[PDB]
């Protein structure tokens, strides 16, 4: 559970000099690419020299050049640190020693006046809530503000953090190389005041949960950048989500994955029962009377039957497809539905395409799904095929997506005992996560109006604990905020 090898603020020259003077052969770090915004670079030292490996993410997955595709940067680094000779003139590159970052930019607790910090800890703070800010009078020094406990039963204690020769301390004891190490140490060994108060560092002060009516003000603030700082602070927390994906790695299931290293978590994966290893599909239940979701990949030819097994077993009545079958010359999803008015058998599952209806942004396909030999198992599945997501980036306007989800939501609500909504793109983490997150947030607003708290990164982190890398890019992160803002404006 450490993402210290990611340096959000260094340059290529800085990374090279840092690896050459503070690292050894096998040392590595990751950083945002300065030449290609939105991409990343893995800088690795070997034989006294540094190599820079490009990592692209257009919105679907992290694509390591000359390597594999991954759901998060943490899952990428974990894979190559644990598989000795995979990273590559075909020359083996070893990730051995993470070169740790000292920049606190991406920490949830790092931020700020002493009055304002007291205000924030006053209003949305709890016992043990804390933050670290730059000192008011002493430049280069810092302050740790902790809430312990409006009647005097709670207080805010400020603790001065002195920076002396690039090491930090709270006036005595140990001297730390970084604010992170200092906070980590006093998290485990909390300071005790003379009269007995224990300055427990329980959780960072939440600053991202806001009232729905404040979203426009917050978006204006993040656009002044605040968006990039908030997103990367979210990305750092991905190291808490390296849950097991063993079932997807079994030999019998390797070919059931569109991308061999983008796999469902074992504890939330959809388990296929009553099979002819026949229980696997690259798909996860997503739980936020709210609806739930199945986030899954675009079908392969050899997983179409499993897809319909899943849809039938989970009683799903709505499918959301957020990709064309072919985009930019590449196949993203095999056609798993019949032509209009046609009927097909996919293993033991029978599907009739009853009728298609074309809107501008999407096609709706009314499908009748049943198990062969059992006419009483028939149920209608409504497939919503979104077709206007741009080849590059995210939509410039969220209106098409919002109108699409509103229709999808009302179809689902009209169906008694409908199961989870199936959502899929290519790998099923980027666009799929974006649609699901928007739908989760919009449903809160739809039922409570402006009188509700929403917390975009918390919602994403919760969804990311159920499928790897849900919401892939900062552009998608911005698009979720813009979609929520637009939805609130048109209430
Ligand atoms: C230097 C920059 O200045 C401000 C700064 C970015 C904005 N701020 C924050 C605080 N917290 C955050 N938590 C998350 S993730 C999350 C959210 C809510 N709840 C839970 N449980 C989780 Cl895990 C994601 C983004 C977050 N941005 C404050 C810190 C930067 N450091």
Short mmCIF file of C-alpha atoms and ligand atoms in Angstrom, two decimals:
data_model
loop_
_atom_site.label_atom_id
_atom_site.label_comp_id
_atom_site.label_asym_id
_atom_site.label_seq_id
_atom_site.Cartn_x
_atom_site.Cartn_y
_atom_site.Cartn_z
CA UNK A 1 0.00 0.00 0.00
CA UNK A 2 2.49 2.62 -1.19
CA UNK A 3 2.42 4.83 -4.29
CA UNK A 4 5.51 6.86 -3.35
CA UNK A 5 7.13 5.96 -6.69
CA UNK A 6 4.82 8.45 -8.47
CA UNK A 7 6.18 12.00 -8.64
CA UNK A 8 3.44 14.42 -9.78
CA UNK A 9 5.61 17.52 -10.23
CA UNK A 10 9.03 16.52 -11.60
CA UNK A 11 10.31 16.85 -15.16
CA UNK A 12 12.17 14.34 -17.31
CA UNK A 13 15.51 16.00 -16.61
CA UNK A 14 14.66 16.12 -12.90
CA UNK A 15 13.67 12.44 -12.94
CA UNK A 16 16.92 11.50 -14.69
CA UNK A 17 19.11 13.42 -12.25
CA UNK A 18 17.12 12.06 -9.30
CA UNK A 19 17.58 8.45 -10.41
CA UNK A 20 21.29 8.99 -11.15
CA UNK A 21 22.15 10.65 -7.82
CA UNK A 22 19.70 9.04 -5.35
CA UNK A 23 18.91 5.70 -7.02
CA UNK A 24 20.74 2.60 -8.18
CA UNK A 25 20.34 0.12 -11.02
CA UNK A 26 16.78 -1.15 -10.82
CA UNK A 27 15.44 2.06 -9.30
CA UNK A 28 12.37 3.53 -10.95
CA UNK A 29 9.67 6.17 -10.71
CA UNK A 30 6.56 7.26 -12.60
CA UNK A 31 5.61 10.79 -13.60
CA UNK A 32 3.16 12.67 -15.82
CA UNK A 33 4.42 13.09 -19.37
CA UNK A 34 5.15 16.73 -20.12
CA UNK A 35 5.27 16.32 -23.91
CA UNK A 36 2.01 14.32 -24.15
CA UNK A 37 -0.58 15.72 -21.71
CA UNK A 38 -2.67 12.90 -20.30
CA UNK A 39 0.11 10.34 -20.79
CA UNK A 40 2.69 9.14 -18.27
CA UNK A 41 6.33 8.09 -18.31
CA UNK A 42 8.08 5.28 -16.43
CA UNK A 43 11.71 6.28 -15.83
CA UNK A 44 14.01 3.36 -14.97
CA UNK A 45 17.72 3.29 -14.16
CA UNK A 46 19.88 0.43 -15.44
CA UNK A 47 23.61 0.11 -16.16
CA UNK A 48 24.12 3.62 -14.82
CA UNK A 49 21.72 5.09 -17.39
CA UNK A 50 18.03 6.05 -17.37
CA UNK A 51 15.38 4.78 -19.79
CA UNK A 52 12.00 6.49 -20.28
CA UNK A 53 9.04 4.23 -21.16
CA UNK A 54 5.89 5.91 -22.44
CA UNK A 55 2.52 5.02 -20.90
CA UNK A 56 -0.51 6.24 -22.86
CA UNK A 57 -4.10 6.47 -21.62
CA UNK A 58 -6.65 7.75 -24.14
CA UNK A 59 -9.50 6.85 -21.77
CA UNK A 60 -9.70 3.04 -21.91
CA UNK A 61 -6.55 1.72 -20.18
CA UNK A 62 -2.94 2.52 -19.34
CA UNK A 63 -0.96 1.36 -22.40
CA UNK A 64 2.72 0.71 -21.64
CA UNK A 65 4.73 1.00 -24.85
CA UNK A 66 6.35 -2.32 -25.65
CA UNK A 67 4.49 -3.83 -22.70
CA UNK A 68 0.93 -4.65 -21.61
CA UNK A 69 -2.26 -2.74 -20.82
CA UNK A 70 -3.28 -2.13 -17.22
CA UNK A 71 -6.20 -0.78 -15.22
CA UNK A 72 -4.16 1.44 -12.85
CA UNK A 73 -0.57 2.59 -12.59
CA UNK A 74 -0.38 0.76 -9.25
CA UNK A 75 -1.51 -2.52 -10.82
CA UNK A 76 1.05 -1.93 -13.59
CA UNK A 77 3.92 -1.44 -11.13
CA UNK A 78 2.77 -4.36 -8.97
CA UNK A 79 2.75 -6.64 -12.02
CA UNK A 80 6.27 -5.85 -13.22
CA UNK A 81 7.74 -5.77 -9.71
CA UNK A 82 6.37 -9.30 -9.22
CA UNK A 83 7.04 -10.72 -12.72
CA UNK A 84 10.79 -10.53 -13.14
CA UNK A 85 11.37 -10.65 -16.89
CA UNK A 86 8.27 -9.22 -18.56
CA UNK A 87 9.19 -5.55 -18.97
CA UNK A 88 11.29 -4.92 -22.07
CA UNK A 89 15.50 -4.34 -28.28
CA UNK A 90 13.66 -6.92 -26.22
CA UNK A 91 16.07 -6.04 -23.41
CA UNK A 92 14.79 -6.93 -19.94
CA UNK A 93 14.09 -3.96 -17.66
CA UNK A 94 13.77 -4.72 -13.95
CA UNK A 95 11.59 -2.67 -11.60
CA UNK A 96 13.32 -3.30 -8.26
CA UNK A 97 13.56 -0.15 -6.11
CA UNK A 98 10.77 2.46 -6.01
CA UNK A 99 12.38 5.89 -5.70
CA UNK A 100 10.07 7.55 -3.19
CA UNK A 101 8.64 11.02 -3.73
CA UNK A 102 8.83 13.62 -0.96
CA UNK A 103 6.35 16.04 -2.56
CA UNK A 104 3.14 16.07 -0.46
CA UNK A 105 1.07 17.46 -3.36
CA UNK A 106 -1.08 14.35 -3.81
CA UNK A 107 -1.81 13.69 -0.12
CA UNK A 108 -5.41 14.03 1.05
CA UNK A 109 -4.33 15.91 4.19
CA UNK A 110 -1.93 18.43 2.60
CA UNK A 111 -3.30 21.82 1.56
CA UNK A 112 -4.18 27.76 4.05
CA UNK A 113 -4.81 30.19 6.90
CA UNK A 114 -4.93 29.11 10.52
CA UNK A 115 -8.35 30.74 10.78
CA UNK A 116 -9.63 29.03 7.62
CA UNK A 117 -8.22 25.68 8.75
CA UNK A 118 -10.07 26.16 12.04
CA UNK A 119 -13.20 27.01 10.03
CA UNK A 120 -12.98 23.87 7.88
CA UNK A 121 -12.20 21.63 10.86
CA UNK A 122 -15.04 23.36 12.73
CA UNK A 123 -17.71 22.74 10.09
CA UNK A 124 -16.96 19.40 8.41
CA UNK A 125 -14.33 18.06 10.82
CA UNK A 126 -14.69 15.14 13.21
CA UNK A 127 -12.64 13.71 16.08
CA UNK A 128 -9.20 12.92 14.71
CA UNK A 129 -9.65 14.93 11.51
CA UNK A 130 -6.40 16.63 10.58
CA UNK A 131 -4.63 18.62 7.87
CA UNK A 132 -1.15 19.93 7.09
CA UNK A 133 -0.70 23.48 5.81
CA UNK A 134 2.14 25.89 5.17
CA UNK A 135 3.00 27.98 8.22
CA UNK A 136 1.61 31.50 8.48
CA UNK A 137 4.62 33.44 9.77
CA UNK A 138 7.56 31.07 9.22
CA UNK A 139 8.06 30.34 5.49
CA UNK A 140 9.09 26.80 4.68
CA UNK A 141 7.63 25.59 7.98
CA UNK A 142 4.29 23.79 8.26
CA UNK A 143 1.40 23.36 10.69
CA UNK A 144 -0.44 20.16 11.61
CA UNK A 145 -3.99 21.09 12.64
CA UNK A 146 -5.91 18.32 14.42
CA UNK A 147 -9.47 18.27 15.73
CA UNK A 148 -10.07 16.38 18.98
CA UNK A 149 -13.14 16.01 21.16
CA UNK A 150 -20.11 24.31 19.66
CA UNK A 151 -19.84 24.11 23.45
CA UNK A 152 -16.12 23.53 24.07
CA UNK A 153 -16.29 19.73 24.04
CA UNK A 154 -14.12 19.73 20.90
CA UNK A 155 -11.01 21.71 20.01
CA UNK A 156 -8.52 22.31 17.20
CA UNK A 157 -4.87 21.88 18.16
CA UNK A 158 -2.10 23.34 16.00
CA UNK A 159 1.32 21.68 15.98
CA UNK A 160 4.24 23.49 14.37
CA UNK A 161 6.34 21.50 11.90
CA UNK A 162 9.79 23.03 11.45
CA UNK A 163 11.75 22.46 8.25
CA UNK A 164 15.47 22.35 9.09
CA UNK A 165 17.96 21.30 6.40
CA UNK A 166 15.16 19.65 4.39
CA UNK A 167 14.03 17.57 7.38
CA UNK A 168 10.81 18.01 9.34
CA UNK A 169 10.05 17.74 13.06
CA UNK A 170 7.49 18.86 15.62
CA UNK A 171 10.02 20.57 17.87
CA UNK A 172 11.78 17.46 19.14
CA UNK A 173 12.36 13.77 18.63
CA UNK A 174 12.78 12.29 15.16
CA UNK A 175 13.59 14.25 12.01
CA UNK A 176 11.82 13.13 8.85
CA UNK A 177 12.72 13.32 5.16
CA UNK A 178 9.13 14.20 4.19
CA UNK A 179 5.84 15.43 5.60
CA UNK A 180 4.40 12.04 4.63
CA UNK A 181 6.85 10.15 6.84
CA UNK A 182 6.17 12.62 9.66
CA UNK A 183 2.40 12.19 9.39
CA UNK A 184 2.79 8.41 9.03
CA UNK A 185 4.90 8.25 12.20
CA UNK A 186 2.59 10.38 14.34
CA UNK A 187 -0.39 8.48 12.96
CA UNK A 188 0.96 5.30 14.58
CA UNK A 189 2.64 6.98 17.60
CA UNK A 190 0.29 9.90 18.32
CA UNK A 191 1.46 12.95 20.21
CA UNK A 192 0.19 13.31 23.78
CA UNK A 193 -0.33 16.69 25.40
CA UNK A 194 0.95 17.42 28.90
CA UNK A 195 -2.55 17.15 30.40
CA UNK A 196 -3.28 13.90 28.55
CA UNK A 197 -5.00 14.76 25.26
CA UNK A 198 -3.96 12.31 22.53
CA UNK A 199 -3.59 14.03 19.15
CA UNK A 200 -4.91 11.09 17.16
CA UNK A 201 -4.49 11.48 13.39
CA UNK A 202 -7.60 9.49 12.55
CA UNK A 203 -8.54 10.64 9.04
CA UNK A 204 -7.78 13.56 6.71
CA UNK A 205 -10.27 16.41 6.78
CA UNK A 206 -12.74 15.87 3.95
CA UNK A 207 -12.69 18.83 1.58
CA UNK A 208 -14.35 17.24 -1.46
CA UNK A 209 -17.87 16.56 -0.15
CA UNK A 210 -20.00 19.61 -1.01
CA UNK A 211 -23.66 20.52 -1.19
CA UNK A 212 -25.15 19.99 -4.65
CA UNK A 213 -25.90 23.70 -5.07
CA UNK A 214 -22.21 24.53 -4.51
CA UNK A 215 -21.01 22.40 -7.44
CA UNK A 216 -20.90 25.30 -9.91
CA UNK A 217 -18.80 27.36 -7.50
CA UNK A 218 -16.51 24.38 -6.89
CA UNK A 219 -16.14 23.71 -10.63
CA UNK A 220 -15.25 27.37 -11.14
CA UNK A 221 -12.64 27.04 -8.38
CA UNK A 222 -11.16 23.81 -9.79
CA UNK A 223 -10.90 25.38 -13.26
CA UNK A 224 -8.87 28.45 -12.21
CA UNK A 225 -5.14 23.86 -11.60
CA UNK A 226 -7.41 22.50 -8.89
CA UNK A 227 -8.83 19.75 -11.11
CA UNK A 228 -5.41 18.17 -11.68
CA UNK A 229 -4.45 18.41 -8.01
CA UNK A 230 -7.72 16.82 -6.87
CA UNK A 231 -7.59 14.04 -9.49
CA UNK A 232 -4.00 13.10 -8.66
CA UNK A 233 -4.84 13.13 -4.95
CA UNK A 234 -7.54 10.61 -5.88
CA UNK A 235 -5.08 8.60 -7.99
CA UNK A 236 -2.69 8.23 -5.05
CA UNK A 237 -5.39 6.37 -3.11
CA UNK A 238 -5.46 3.61 -5.75
CA UNK A 239 -2.72 1.76 -3.83
CA UNK A 240 -5.38 0.85 -1.23
CA UNK A 241 -7.30 -1.14 -3.87
CA UNK A 242 -4.84 -3.86 -4.98
CA UNK A 243 -7.26 -6.67 -4.18
CA UNK A 244 -6.78 -10.19 -5.49
CA UNK A 245 -7.67 -11.13 -9.08
CA UNK A 246 -6.60 -14.78 -9.01
CA UNK A 247 -9.62 -16.29 -10.80
CA UNK A 248 -8.97 -14.14 -13.86
CA UNK A 249 -5.35 -15.34 -13.93
CA UNK A 250 -6.19 -19.06 -14.09
CA UNK A 251 -5.10 -20.81 -17.29
CA UNK A 252 -8.67 -21.69 -18.29
CA UNK A 253 -9.76 -18.03 -18.02
CA UNK A 254 -6.81 -16.21 -19.64
CA UNK A 255 -8.50 -16.22 -23.06
CA UNK A 256 -11.77 -14.92 -21.57
CA UNK A 257 -10.18 -11.50 -20.95
CA UNK A 258 -9.98 -8.83 -23.64
CA UNK A 259 -6.79 -7.61 -21.94
CA UNK A 260 -4.85 -10.22 -19.99
CA UNK A 261 -3.94 -7.90 -17.09
CA UNK A 262 -7.29 -6.08 -16.74
CA UNK A 263 -9.18 -8.47 -14.48
CA UNK A 264 -12.15 -8.50 -12.09
CA UNK A 265 -11.62 -8.48 -8.35
CA UNK A 266 -12.33 -11.92 -6.91
CA UNK A 267 -14.57 -10.61 -4.14
CA UNK A 268 -16.93 -8.67 -6.45
CA UNK A 269 -16.67 -10.70 -9.68
CA UNK A 270 -19.83 -12.10 -11.24
CA UNK A 271 -19.85 -15.85 -10.60
CA UNK A 272 -21.60 -17.84 -13.34
CA UNK A 273 -23.53 -20.78 -11.89
CA UNK A 274 -25.22 -23.82 -13.45
CA UNK A 275 -22.61 -24.16 -16.19
CA UNK A 276 -21.78 -27.00 -18.54
CA UNK A 277 -13.90 -23.86 -15.26
CA UNK A 278 -17.24 -22.46 -16.43
CA UNK A 279 -18.00 -19.88 -13.71
CA UNK A 280 -15.85 -17.00 -14.98
CA UNK A 281 -16.62 -13.79 -16.84
CA UNK A 282 -14.67 -10.54 -16.80
CA UNK A 283 -17.34 -8.59 -14.93
CA UNK A 284 -17.97 -7.10 -11.49
CA UNK A 285 -21.04 -6.17 -9.49
CA UNK A 286 -21.00 -2.45 -8.66
CA UNK A 287 -23.08 -1.39 -5.66
CA UNK A 288 -23.52 2.30 -4.71
CA UNK A 289 -33.85 1.80 -3.43
CA UNK A 290 -30.84 2.45 -5.66
CA UNK A 291 -30.00 0.35 -8.69
CA UNK A 292 -26.81 -1.70 -8.88
CA UNK A 293 -24.59 -2.31 -11.89
CA UNK A 294 -22.54 -4.95 -13.64
CA UNK A 295 -19.41 -3.41 -15.14
CA UNK A 296 -17.97 -5.70 -17.81
CA UNK A 297 -15.82 -5.78 -20.93
CA UNK A 298 -16.88 -5.82 -24.55
CA UNK A 299 -17.64 -9.38 -25.58
CA UNK A 300 -15.10 -11.59 -27.26
CA UNK A 301 -16.27 -14.23 -29.72
CA UNK A 302 -15.60 -16.92 -27.11
CA UNK A 303 -17.41 -15.06 -24.29
CA UNK A 304 -20.73 -14.20 -25.98
CA UNK A 305 -22.46 -17.24 -24.48
CA UNK A 306 -21.10 -16.38 -21.03
CA UNK A 307 -22.36 -12.81 -21.44
CA UNK A 308 -25.94 -13.98 -21.97
CA UNK A 309 -25.58 -16.51 -19.16
CA UNK A 310 -24.65 -13.56 -16.94
CA UNK A 311 -27.52 -11.35 -18.15
CA UNK A 312 -30.03 -14.15 -17.59
CA UNK A 313 -28.67 -15.27 -14.21
CA UNK A 314 -28.52 -11.77 -12.71
CA UNK A 315 -32.02 -10.90 -14.03
CA UNK A 316 -30.62 -7.86 -15.85
CA UNK A 317 -33.22 -6.06 -17.96
CA UNK A 318 -31.06 -3.18 -19.28
CA UNK A 319 -27.70 -3.17 -21.09
CA UNK A 320 -25.70 0.01 -21.69
CA UNK A 321 -23.14 -0.18 -24.50
CA UNK A 322 -20.81 2.84 -24.58
CA UNK A 323 -18.69 1.95 -27.62
CA UNK A 324 -19.06 1.28 -31.30
CA UNK A 325 -18.27 -2.25 -32.43
CA UNK A 326 -15.25 -0.81 -34.26
CA UNK A 327 -13.53 2.46 -33.33
CA UNK A 328 -10.46 3.77 -35.17
CA UNK A 329 -10.07 0.49 -37.04
CA UNK A 330 -9.96 -1.63 -33.87
CA UNK A 331 -12.56 -4.08 -32.59
CA UNK A 332 -13.90 -3.06 -29.18
CA UNK A 333 -16.88 -5.43 -28.88
CA UNK A 334 -18.09 -8.36 -30.95
CA UNK A 335 -21.71 -8.18 -32.09
CA UNK A 336 -23.49 -10.20 -29.39
CA UNK A 337 -27.06 -9.42 -30.49
CA UNK A 338 -29.10 -10.50 -33.52
CA UNK A 339 -30.05 -8.26 -36.40
CA UNK A 340 -33.45 -6.61 -36.13
CA UNK A 341 -36.34 -9.13 -36.30
CA UNK A 342 -33.83 -12.02 -36.20
CA UNK A 343 -33.48 -14.75 -33.57
CA UNK A 344 -30.26 -16.44 -32.46
CA UNK A 345 -29.17 -19.06 -29.95
CA UNK A 346 -26.06 -18.25 -27.89
CA UNK A 347 -25.39 -21.57 -26.22
CA UNK A 348 -28.40 -22.35 -24.04
CA UNK A 349 -29.68 -18.76 -24.31
CA UNK A 350 -32.10 -17.59 -27.00
CA UNK A 351 -32.27 -13.93 -28.05
CA UNK A 352 -34.77 -12.29 -30.40
CA UNK A 353 -34.19 -8.72 -31.58
CA UNK A 354 -37.77 -7.49 -31.42
CA UNK A 355 -37.27 -3.93 -32.67
CA UNK A 356 -34.62 -1.22 -32.98
CA UNK A 357 -35.20 2.50 -32.43
CA UNK A 358 -32.61 5.07 -33.49
CA UNK A 359 -32.04 8.34 -31.68
CA UNK A 360 -29.15 10.61 -32.62
CA UNK A 361 -26.90 9.66 -29.70
CA UNK A 362 -27.95 6.03 -29.37
CA UNK A 363 -29.79 3.00 -30.71
CA UNK A 364 -32.29 1.14 -28.53
CA UNK A 365 -32.71 -2.59 -29.18
CA UNK A 366 -35.66 -4.41 -27.61
CA UNK A 367 -34.36 -7.94 -27.00
CA UNK A 368 -36.27 -10.99 -25.78
CA UNK A 369 -34.00 -13.30 -23.77
CA UNK A 370 -34.91 -16.84 -22.73
CA UNK A 371 -33.35 -20.22 -22.00
CA UNK A 372 -33.79 -22.83 -24.73
CA UNK A 373 -36.47 -25.41 -23.96
CA UNK A 374 -38.18 -23.19 -21.34
CA UNK A 375 -40.65 -20.67 -22.76
CA UNK A 376 -41.57 -19.41 -19.29
CA UNK A 377 -38.09 -17.90 -18.75
CA UNK A 378 -38.59 -15.10 -21.29
CA UNK A 379 -37.91 -11.51 -20.28
CA UNK A 380 -37.27 -8.33 -22.24
CA UNK A 381 -33.75 -6.87 -22.19
CA UNK A 382 -33.45 -3.26 -23.38
CA UNK A 383 -30.05 -2.59 -24.96
CA UNK A 384 -29.04 1.09 -25.05
CA UNK A 385 -26.16 1.45 -27.53
CA UNK A 386 -24.49 4.85 -27.14
CA UNK A 387 -22.75 5.66 -30.43
CA UNK A 388 -21.56 9.31 -30.26
CA UNK A 389 -18.74 9.09 -27.71
CA UNK A 390 -15.83 10.78 -29.53
CA UNK A 391 -12.81 8.84 -30.72
CA UNK A 392 -10.59 11.21 -28.71
CA UNK A 393 -11.25 12.27 -25.13
CA UNK A 394 -14.72 12.95 -23.73
CA UNK A 395 -17.82 14.68 -25.13
CA UNK A 396 -17.60 18.46 -25.18
CA UNK A 397 -21.19 18.66 -23.89
CA UNK A 398 -22.72 16.27 -21.31
CA UNK A 399 -26.28 16.74 -22.58
CA UNK A 400 -26.34 13.65 -24.77
CA UNK A 401 -24.96 11.50 -21.96
CA UNK A 402 -27.36 12.98 -19.39
CA UNK A 403 -30.45 12.56 -21.59
CA UNK A 404 -29.23 9.03 -22.34
CA UNK A 405 -28.87 8.10 -18.66
CA UNK A 406 -32.22 9.69 -17.76
CA UNK A 407 -33.95 7.47 -20.32
CA UNK A 408 -31.98 4.42 -19.15
CA UNK A 409 -32.88 5.20 -15.54
CA UNK A 410 -36.61 5.43 -16.25
CA UNK A 411 -36.71 2.21 -18.27
CA UNK A 412 -35.04 0.45 -15.33
CA UNK A 413 -37.40 1.98 -12.76
CA UNK A 414 -40.43 0.90 -14.81
CA UNK A 415 -39.42 -2.78 -14.59
CA UNK A 416 -40.40 -4.57 -11.39
CA UNK A 417 -37.64 -6.69 -9.82
CA UNK A 418 -35.15 -5.76 -12.54
CA UNK A 419 -31.60 -6.83 -11.79
CA UNK A 420 -28.41 -4.80 -12.15
CA UNK A 421 -27.87 -2.59 -15.18
CA UNK A 422 -25.14 -4.07 -17.37
CA UNK A 423 -22.66 -1.43 -18.54
CA UNK A 424 -19.74 -2.13 -20.87
CA UNK A 425 -17.30 -0.48 -23.26
CA UNK A 426 -14.03 -2.09 -24.37
CA UNK A 427 -12.09 -2.96 -21.22
CA UNK A 428 -15.07 -1.92 -19.10
CA UNK A 429 -13.29 0.49 -16.75
CA UNK A 430 -12.94 3.86 -18.49
CA UNK A 431 -16.13 4.95 -20.21
CA UNK A 432 -18.00 2.27 -18.24
CA UNK A 433 -16.80 3.70 -14.94
CA UNK A 434 -17.58 7.23 -16.14
CA UNK A 435 -21.18 6.38 -17.05
CA UNK A 436 -21.77 4.46 -13.82
CA UNK A 437 -20.31 7.22 -11.62
CA UNK A 438 -22.41 9.90 -13.33
CA UNK A 439 -25.50 7.71 -12.94
CA UNK A 440 -24.79 7.18 -9.22
CA UNK A 441 -24.34 10.89 -8.55
CA UNK A 442 -27.31 11.96 -10.70
CA UNK A 443 -29.60 9.52 -8.87
CA UNK A 444 -28.82 11.20 -5.54
CA UNK A 445 -29.70 14.59 -7.03
CA UNK A 446 -32.81 13.25 -8.78
CA UNK A 447 -34.29 12.12 -5.45
CA UNK A 448 -33.09 14.95 -3.17
CA UNK A 449 -32.65 17.92 -5.49
CA UNK A 450 -30.06 20.50 -4.49
CA UNK A 451 -30.45 19.55 -0.80
CA UNK A 452 -27.86 16.78 -0.83
CA UNK A 453 -24.14 16.20 -0.35
CA UNK A 454 -22.16 14.78 -3.26
CA UNK A 455 -18.50 13.73 -3.12
CA UNK A 456 -17.16 12.88 -6.58
CA UNK A 457 -13.76 11.36 -5.62
CA UNK A 458 -15.25 9.37 -2.73
CA UNK A 459 -17.88 7.92 -5.06
CA UNK A 460 -15.18 7.02 -7.60
CA UNK A 461 -12.95 5.42 -4.94
CA UNK A 462 -15.92 3.37 -3.71
CA UNK A 463 -16.62 2.19 -7.26
CA UNK A 464 -12.89 1.55 -7.79
CA UNK A 465 -12.91 -0.86 -4.83
CA UNK A 466 -15.32 -3.07 -6.82
CA UNK A 467 -13.63 -3.00 -10.25
CA UNK A 468 -10.06 -2.04 -11.10
CA UNK A 469 -9.48 1.48 -12.36
CA UNK A 470 -13.07 2.67 -12.74
CA UNK A 471 -12.77 6.13 -14.34
CA UNK A 472 -9.47 6.24 -16.23
CA UNK A 473 -8.46 9.82 -17.05
CA UNK A 474 -8.51 13.36 -15.71
CA UNK A 475 -10.63 14.31 -18.73
CA UNK A 476 -13.28 11.81 -17.63
CA UNK A 477 -12.94 13.13 -14.07
CA UNK A 478 -13.64 16.64 -15.37
CA UNK A 479 -16.53 15.32 -17.47
CA UNK A 480 -18.23 13.78 -14.42
CA UNK A 481 -18.10 17.15 -12.65
CA UNK A 482 -19.46 18.88 -15.76
CA UNK A 483 -22.26 16.32 -16.16
CA UNK A 484 -23.30 16.71 -12.52
CA UNK A 485 -23.14 20.51 -12.85
CA UNK A 486 -25.27 20.48 -16.01
CA UNK A 487 -27.84 18.14 -14.45
CA UNK A 488 -28.19 20.41 -11.42
CA UNK A 489 -28.57 23.53 -13.59
CA UNK A 490 -31.53 22.10 -15.54
CA UNK A 491 -33.53 21.09 -12.45
C1 LIG B 1 -2.00 20.04 -2.85
C2 LIG B 1 -3.50 19.93 -3.21
O1 LIG B 1 -4.18 20.94 -2.46
C3 LIG B 1 -5.53 20.54 -2.20
C4 LIG B 1 -5.53 19.00 -2.28
C5 LIG B 1 -6.53 18.53 -3.37
C6 LIG B 1 -7.98 18.72 -2.88
N1 LIG B 1 -8.23 18.06 -1.59
C7 LIG B 1 -8.58 16.71 -1.50
C8 LIG B 1 -8.81 16.08 -0.27
N2 LIG B 1 -9.14 14.76 -0.21
C9 LIG B 1 -9.24 14.09 -1.39
N3 LIG B 1 -9.58 12.78 -1.30
C10 LIG B 1 -9.70 12.05 -2.44
S1 LIG B 1 -10.14 10.34 -2.30
C11 LIG B 1 -11.40 10.35 -1.05
C12 LIG B 1 -12.30 11.42 -0.94
C13 LIG B 1 -13.27 11.39 0.07
N4 LIG B 1 -13.37 10.35 0.95
C14 LIG B 1 -12.50 9.32 0.84
N5 LIG B 1 -12.65 8.29 1.77
C15 LIG B 1 -11.49 9.28 -0.14
CL1 LIG B 1 -10.39 7.94 -0.24
C16 LIG B 1 -9.48 12.61 -3.71
C17 LIG B 1 -9.14 13.96 -3.80
C18 LIG B 1 -9.02 14.72 -2.63
N6 LIG B 1 -8.68 16.04 -2.68
C19 LIG B 1 -7.36 18.67 -0.57
C20 LIG B 1 -5.87 18.40 -0.90
C21 LIG B 1 -4.11 18.61 -2.70
N7 LIG B 1 -3.30 17.82 -1.66
#
